[PDB]
Amino acid sequence: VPSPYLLSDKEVREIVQQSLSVGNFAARLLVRLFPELFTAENLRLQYNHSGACNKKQLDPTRLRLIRHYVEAVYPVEKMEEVWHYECIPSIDERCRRPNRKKCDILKKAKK
C-alpha cells in the first residue's frame, strides 16, 4: 500500500530547485509533509525531531521519508554526518523558528 505522503519525481524536483542546501531541502520537505504543523496555529512549536527538551516527536515514519528523499537526491559520501549535523538541525530550526525575531519585537516597541 503506497503511502499518501509520497511525492512525485516532478514534485521533488520543484522542491530541490528551490533548495539552497541539503539542509534546506530537508526543511522544505518537513513543511510539505507536515502541513498540520505549519498552519496559523503553529503547532510546529510543540515538536522537534526527537522529542528532546520535553517536546513532542515528529512522526517517525515521515521523518524516515524525509531522509529517504534527501538520500535519493543529494550526495551520499557522508550521509550519516549530513543527516545528523545538517538536516536534523535544519528540521528542528524550522519547527522552532519564531514568526518575529526578538530584536524586531523590541525594535518596534519603540515605534
Partner DNA sequence: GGACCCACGCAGC
Partner DNA sequence: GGCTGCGTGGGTC
Cell of 7: 511525492
Cell of 64: 524516515
Q: Which stretch binds DNA (CB under 7 A): 7-15, 58-66, 72-80, 99-107?
A: 99-107
Q: How buried is 32 (Cβ within 10 angstroms: 0-12 exposed, 13-18 middle, 19+ buried)?
A: middle
41 touching DNA, by CB under 7 A: no
Q: How far is the CB of 94 from DNA (least distance, A)?
A: 6
Whether the Cβ atoms of residue 26 and residue 90 lie closer than 8 Å to each other: yes
User: How many residues in the shown chain lie near DNA by CB under 7 A?
Assistant: 30
How many angstroms separate the CA atoms of 19 and 92, rounded? 17
> Closest CB to DNA among 1 and 109?
109
69 touching DNA, by CB under 7 A: no
Binding site for DNA (CB under 7 A): 20-21, 23-24, 27-28, 48-50, 52-53, 55, 84, 88-90, 92-104, 108
